[PDB]
Assembly symmetry: C3
Homo-oligomer: 169 residues x 3
């Protein structure tokens, strides 16, 4: 139903998963102003289930080996990937322009992990009426475990599908 005409930031929660070298969504919902309802399904939701969820944009993070566009070193838990399936059921193509991460607060409620990282992200078009792959990588200084796995994810959504077209050499 939604026909977006402006950019908007989508703020979601995610956790690192050592086994599989993945990021994993926290399930829940988010009412946006321009993109309808964002529905974050449970982990590993299949494509046929994903298109039945009650929202305008449906996301699931996938776990387990093979769900990787990136060579992570599975011998450690420093190199992590979000491998997400995103159902765009709005009336327009959406570009995910950029992402950023902040660590969440740990158990104390008053400290955050200062585990430094490099973020990998390439702008990604979410075609409408389609389930799309969406990924970002993060490579940390220190292993991700249970003490330091909590992160806050910011994604910028914008209308359309226009991307840089490389010219001649």
């Amino acid at each position: 139903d939604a026909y977006p005409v402006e950019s908007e930031i989508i703020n979601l929660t995610i956790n690192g998963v050592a086994r599989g070298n993945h990021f994993n969504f926290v399930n829940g919902t988010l009412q946006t102003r321009n993109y309808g309802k964002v529905y974050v399904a449970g982990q590993g939701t299949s494509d046929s289930e994903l298109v039945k969820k009650k929202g305008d944009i449906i996301l699931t993070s996938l776990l387990g080996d093979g769900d990787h566009t990136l060579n992570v070193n599975k011998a450690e838990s420093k190199e992590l990937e979000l491998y997400a399936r995103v159902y765009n059921n709005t009336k327009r193509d959406i570009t995910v322009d950029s992402v950023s991460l902040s660590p969440g607060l740990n158990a104390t409620g008053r400290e955050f992990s200062a585990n430094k990282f490099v973020l990998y992200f390439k702008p990604t078009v979410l075609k409408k009426n389609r389930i799309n792959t969406l990924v970002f990588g993060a490579t940390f200084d220190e292993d991700i475990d249970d003490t330091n796995r909590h992160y806050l994810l910011s994604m910028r959504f914008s209308p359309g599908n226009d991307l840089f077209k490389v010219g001649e050499k």
Copy 2:
């Protein structure tokens, strides 16, 4: 008077303060397109003074111990917190979606501090007709002192108060 309907980036200047482990605003003003006038009062402005300033959104950074939502290691000056009071006197709730930092130029005018850091920030609603607490943390590799304390702060403002609602386990 202002009734915002689009997101906007607010660019302000801040300095690290070793004693107290804080960030501190540079006072001044900023004319925005969608959020009226931003007024950055002097440090430690009290709540009753803050609501008398001439602007649509009034900010002050607080210094001195106790003004911390975060356990900073006061034995050093690597872990810093912005503890700000923000008066939203527009006609709508505002969400601060994200922040980012850049070091400013040092005394040479041609170099910047490459002191690496991890930024902590959780999206924060600024309720209208209310003074709100706004914080972010930064944990640096190296101590902040007089040679390397100058920073540029970017905040994204957006209309409304909608946030992620966590679902069931």
Copy 3:
């Protein structure tokens, strides 16, 4: 022809250049929704050539010594600068609010450089009917060479020229 009234993110590709300590654009074009056509000319395009290109906003990155607002250590290739000339041929002033970088994928197509960096950027007004200097710096942990030089650049454009005005001491 373009009269922008909203902010937009511009996603471009850039490479590090060890000799000269620069970033260098990949030439090409980008259709924006609010800022007309972005035209990225070849490196070192002169000012008289730059204003003849077919676009609404024309950019070139300059190489070679002297094209630096920043003291880079030319003895190594860790400290890099984008020194760009930008022709704003829209009907309004544009502010570049912020920038961010992501490494691109390397030759494997499945790995990215985790070379950590500190980004320097100060908000910059692109005056209309003028060629403007636009710069950002990046200081890396490790030397930039042929294995790790590929980056993705995000710039946020917004209308107008309003900037923070510093108050009295």
